[PDB]
Amino acid sequence: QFNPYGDNGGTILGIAGEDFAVLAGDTRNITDYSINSRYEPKVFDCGDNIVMSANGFAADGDALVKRFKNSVKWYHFDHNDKKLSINSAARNIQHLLYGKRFFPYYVHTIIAGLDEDGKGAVYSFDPVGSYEREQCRAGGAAASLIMPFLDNQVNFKNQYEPGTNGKVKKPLKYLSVEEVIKLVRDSFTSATERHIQVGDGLEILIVTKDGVRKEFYELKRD
Amino acid sequence: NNYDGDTVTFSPTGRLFQVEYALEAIKQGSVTVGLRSNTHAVLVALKRNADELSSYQKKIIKCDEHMGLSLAGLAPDARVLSNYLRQQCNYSSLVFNRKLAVERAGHLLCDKAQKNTQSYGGRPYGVGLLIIGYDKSGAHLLEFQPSGNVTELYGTAIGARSQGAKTYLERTLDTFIKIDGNPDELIKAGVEAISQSLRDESLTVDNLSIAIVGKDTPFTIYDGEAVAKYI
Amino acid sequence: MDIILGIRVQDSVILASSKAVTRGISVLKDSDDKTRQLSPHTLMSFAGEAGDTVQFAEYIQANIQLYSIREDYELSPQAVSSFVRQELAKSIRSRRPYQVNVLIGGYDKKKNKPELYQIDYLGTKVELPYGAHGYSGFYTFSLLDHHYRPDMTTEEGLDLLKLCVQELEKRMPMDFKGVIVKIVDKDGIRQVDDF
Amino acid sequence: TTTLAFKFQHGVIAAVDSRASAGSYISALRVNKVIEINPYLLGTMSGCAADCQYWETLLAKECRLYYLRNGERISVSAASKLLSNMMCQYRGMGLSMGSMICGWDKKGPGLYYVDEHGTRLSGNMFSTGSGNTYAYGVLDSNYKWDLSVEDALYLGKRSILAAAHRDAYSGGSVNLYHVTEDGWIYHGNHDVGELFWKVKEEEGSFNNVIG
Amino acid sequence: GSRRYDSRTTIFSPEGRLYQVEYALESISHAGTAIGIMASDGIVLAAERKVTSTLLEQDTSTEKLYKLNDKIAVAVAGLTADAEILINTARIHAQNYLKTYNEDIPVEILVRRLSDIKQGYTQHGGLRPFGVSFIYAGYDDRYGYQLYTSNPSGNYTGWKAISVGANTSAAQTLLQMDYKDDMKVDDAIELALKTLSKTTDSSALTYDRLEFATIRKGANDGEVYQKIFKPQEIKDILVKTGIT
Amino acid sequence: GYDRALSIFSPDGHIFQVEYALEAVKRGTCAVGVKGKNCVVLGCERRSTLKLQDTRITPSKVSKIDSHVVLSFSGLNADSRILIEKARVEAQSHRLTLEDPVTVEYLTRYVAGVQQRYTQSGGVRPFGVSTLIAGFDPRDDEPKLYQTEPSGIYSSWSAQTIGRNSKTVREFLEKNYDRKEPPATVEECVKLTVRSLLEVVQTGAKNIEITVVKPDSDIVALSSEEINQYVTQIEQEKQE
Amino acid sequence: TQQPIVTGTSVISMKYDNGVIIAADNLGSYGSLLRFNGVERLIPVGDNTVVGISGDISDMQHIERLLKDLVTENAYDNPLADAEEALEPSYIFEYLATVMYQRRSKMNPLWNAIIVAGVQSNGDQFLRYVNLLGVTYSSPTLATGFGAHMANPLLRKVVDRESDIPKTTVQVAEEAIVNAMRVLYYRDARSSRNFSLAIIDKNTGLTFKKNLQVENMKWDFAKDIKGYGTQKI
Amino acid sequence: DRGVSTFSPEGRLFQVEYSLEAIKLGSTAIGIATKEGVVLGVEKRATSPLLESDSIEKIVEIDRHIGCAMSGLTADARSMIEHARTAAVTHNLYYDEDINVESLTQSVCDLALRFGELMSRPFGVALLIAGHDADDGYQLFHAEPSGTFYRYNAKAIGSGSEGAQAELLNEWHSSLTLKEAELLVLKILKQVMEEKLDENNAQLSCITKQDGFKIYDNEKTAELIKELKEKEAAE
């Protein structure tokens, strides 16, 4: 019997800063125990200062991104070159996904950018369109490996202030882009060690008011 | 006379009067000029207002990053035809990862307009279009008529009093074709061309509309204080 | 839903219907009224799959109310029961059938007679002196076979009905949270608020 | 999920948890399971998140159009029915959506339970989700019509807490709403970790747990 | 295109009339007269066949009176072919109702249905209307004995006594004169025939130029019988009433 | 399908088919609507050219759309049945989807929308019918009276008349009906409705039909004798 | 939904400094039966592109006809059909990728794995994969079926990353491809000795080599192997 | 007869031009745009004194940030309004935001030329669409049955349009307040109306960023009418 779905592995990671956002993802593409590509871009600049990644079944992911990029193009045509806000993009993507509620795009999607007040924004989706704005989100194969680390190191969960002994929490001080990129690189290095579908390369897309910037880092190829 | 009731009827001399009447709507429309060099292509359009309280009707429409047009006649028909071009330019990109050739865009418009001239019930399009674009064979300018006839040109003009601008371009042919790597000078030649079609009124800041596309220049429209430089 | 009973006495029809509604392992409601008035002298109780029951009942209600307005006339219980049967018989061969069993209790003003019709989800109609759907009849029909007379009063009908509910409450494993009882006679439809 | 909602003297209380699961994995610590349809209408969410979000967001579109056509706000009864009718179109197609439509209209406060089977029930108290049984225990033994706004808010809060503790698929935080005739009023996000220890000490409950 | 040849059958005149309906009524005015008379104990239907021949097989012929079901019958005035289209539709509606409700269709409901079909042809579809006027004779247990008429406009009305087809103006005046409310079937039979005998364009009214029918509770006990008269039976009633 | 555009604009900006539909309404029998302080009354003319009529079974001029709303009309009788049916279906459809009966304003807006649709749809002609739609909204004691016409426009009226010689009875209503103090009782409301028809009707015998609609689904049709008593009292006061 | 009947095995390919190489054997298998021995599974499109196809042959012949029709259609009203507006490898791939993903979305896939190899207008190497699921990816080396498991490891020793492409000559690349084809003949039970090889170079254009054979095979050591454990004779 | 989508020898669609004549017969509607808001006002024109004038609804809400006035065959406007409301709320569903006034107008105007032998004829009604959005601020559009729409600083449509438009030509300036605009609409309405203007036969409305679209009470308008009379008597 024909199986229309597949699993191309990979892992993605979005973190929202005070006035910036990052969306990262490994560049490895796989089927079963084989490597298709060591460098196959997975995170895309979709225009209007928005970055997007649909991780899981690559065919469905590429189709979704292609369709959303197309939605942005037609938004400009239909609404006098108005900029598509990150909240408006998120709602648009919900409808793209739920339109195939009974034959789902088999992907976990994440977009990142800046809200209309200039603050960093990440939005996270499920395969059938349910979404919400979040501060931190890892998606894909090693999502369960990475998310707890981020609960601990980004939102300071289970961390208290010494001497008080569990009475006073660690205060939620904001993170700089340099600090976030460290947590991203350590997150992927750790995921690469313990997950066979993660490796080869890491590509990070950083979003600020100045635009979209890219950073690439090597990962273990085993 | 007896043979102008619908588009499905030839006259005794082999004329299609409904198509000719649709052609008449273009002559009533405001003037628009098109011209190109080897590097860039430029549209210049005289916008028309209803009165002093009203805005100036937009004339230029973007179809893709590398293609767009200016209109003269029934504006809603231009919206339909430009929407069709947007879809066709987009079908070429999504399916073939290919920017639609300006010549092929003209062929598609011709064939769309033609179907309306041979069938009962419908009507011809009541608008003329000047399509500019930059593709793999350089800069291009097309003139569309709702009879179906599409023509590739160095320069042209359509609308009321368009003959004056068309004569100017016919003289200036050898000069403006050579304006390579100089967008501002090519626009100047277009603004000077459209000026030959003006009477009583002159080019003001909210009157003039300009668009350009080229080698390293996406299709962009200039309105308002952005065209004060060229007045 | 679970249990719906019906009994036709001398001059009225009495319908008793359970109050429970269950989702998963939790009883969400213990005061549900599993019935719709189709016309002033015609009442329909229902039981079957979740959702389908109310949708079907309301759809029937709307159609009879439309007939009443159009003709300025109340359809006989027999006519209504035949309409309902055809809709269920039509439904059973549909893509997704409506899984609903009904009792129709009505008082025919022309003949001056009470009438009770039992119709299952297949479109199986029978006129009866007393009726039930599902497992309800397994416990109650022996009592009704024994005690039922056609010349019974409304009060005797209610007493025989109380005996039926008591037997159900004793020998059924499920808690159906008592019943709402309604009486259909020449004067119309009224609910017995204490049962 | 666990969600609950109940009518009382001073309107209706609505309380939900904030967890989301993908098997044993807790996929979200803080999801919003209440939708603000309009200033006087709320909707709770339980089941498939996508279904809950899509159809209740669409319900809000349809309730807004009602206001534009009629120049009056939609009733809670009508709003619940529009939603139950949406469920009946996708009857058997595999949706999963359990919700309470809470609000205040001309008949006073209203509360309707609606699920994917097209069920539509009116009542004074409801609770949906994997942890509804735990919530019902507290609600049933403590509920009165004569509750004060302060005591009612606490009951809804404490009932979710009970469920969050025992139900593995309920937790994260508690979101409280109070619906009045001037509209709904949000009463905050309450972390269950902190709330548990607080309630344990102040109430003396959860004696078996060590803290 | 095709527009050139469209007569536009469904339009108003400047005066607010429907051309085709008015012209259809003009057609019907040349058709053989049909009369219906309602009595307390039954209904009479009498109708005149149009200029017949001696070689027409009368006993097997039917152009005027048709049976819709056991309780309802109609008299036709206009195009017979058009009438048969409508009659077969009405026969189906009556059976659809019987299947649905397990009761015989009330007369008015059947009449309204046929009249709604006629109406549709005057408002949409661009087709010519049916050039037919019906007299409906029927019985049901709500209103008892009932007479109705419908015409190409799709408008219907109830009557105690009525005529359609030719010379309705003259026929209605004669009926209005001699009709009384306490009248009986045997008296109504006589009135119907006498009216036709005076209004007819023929020289003399004979059995071979008539179709006749009665709907009586003159059936054994509480039930209704339809009687489509045979040629010999029409001959006998003509002698009985003293016309031939 | 038959798609022919029958209702179209003329050079002077008129849709003749819609205007000729109004002429069909002008031909129709007179209908009148008067709302009192706690009621609405609908009066209707019956032309006495048709005797030997069976009044038991003949279609009545006033039609119930629901238990709380009624509809009378002037114009083509066959056309009116189609609007009435559609209205009755929409009334049950509203109860089924929204769980409230239609408001009088909503029902009017629907019927008016149907009439409008038949003025710019292909292959169809406009309804040769104007309607008076009256009743009381659920749990409301304020009277409602609306009018519709072939074009599809509708509006609310304190009192209104349509049909043949409606110009005359409207003239009567305009001088006799006071807005500051409307017919306080049912009697006064019916009396004013009968008086208005007596300007046009001819004989006050079986030519006048009256239907009184009161709040909370209280609708009754007056009989011949009841109306005849109003006719008697009016003329006896007039002899002075 | 179907099952593949007549099938072609591995298609292998790689980039080198001035272009791309692609290869595939000439066998059409019918299950374990080696039915058809003269099947061409590399299909040139113009003089700048070669499409290599594995999987169901009937679907391959269908795709072959779509490409033939694509060339015809591109020439229509196109004075620059053999110049600026000629078909690019990227156009051909995207078309096929669109078709493949549409067909899988209708639950009626073309049961194939396809590699489009070619050189673009600007001289850039093009090498991209697509299959019955509509899944696409690009890499310095690409291979289908068994080739993915056995050829890629060998080809990746020559070009391990992007920076190794300019350092790899056509002689070294062809040598690696030919060795890979030999290894596949040793170890793939649905492979044949006969194969075809195509080189698309930005300077020398399209070179299409037919009737190639696997040679220099090692079998002599087999004579010494006796029994399955304890047997000496 | 002749096609519905036929061109005249001058290059105009007969039916579109004829619908414009129907709009000239309609009751007057005026719109004035300012930096403090956009004002919409209409002539009700009741055919009889028994007609309850408050049921005349010629000013209509499309969304909280968009209002609409009509003139001509007002029955034709109902389907246009329904489409506008649906388009406005549907865009809010898809994009979680208010829709631009221009985009809403463009959606309404797309219906216009969908006629032939789709609906059988063009609409016999013109619309003044007024609203506010964050990108282009306060806006006033004039939507015709031709499918064309012009933006206006001030515009009058209906029977007294050319007389009112000439008056709007002189009176409008870029520094008008909301109060000044209100009186100006009342002034010009009073000038072109047959009957004497009062709170019962004329209606005002406005759209502001803060409060959104509001139809004015008869008591509120009555005061503005009284304020107008006094300031005209002041010189």
Ligand SMILES: *[C@@]([C])([C][O])[C@](*)(=O)[C]([C]C1=[C][C]=[C][C]=[C]1)[N]C(=O)[C]([C]C1=[C][N]C2=C1[C]=[C][C]=[C]2)[N]C(=O)[C]([C])[N]C(=O)C1=C([C])C2=C([C]1)[C]=[C][C]=[C]2
């Ligand atoms: C309980 C917390 C779960 O038992 C409750 O029922 C919630 C309700 C809820 C409502 C709105 C938003 C989120 C949750 N349900 C879920 O958490 C469901 C449970 C479920 C899993 N499979 C399934 C379920 C229910 C019915 C059929 C099948 N969880 C989900 O729907 C899963 C698919 N959701 C996610 O994974 C989400 C992710 C990731 C995510 C979401 C939802 C929202 C925002 C960002 C990311």
Ligand SMILES: [Mg+2]
């Ligand atoms: Mg690894």
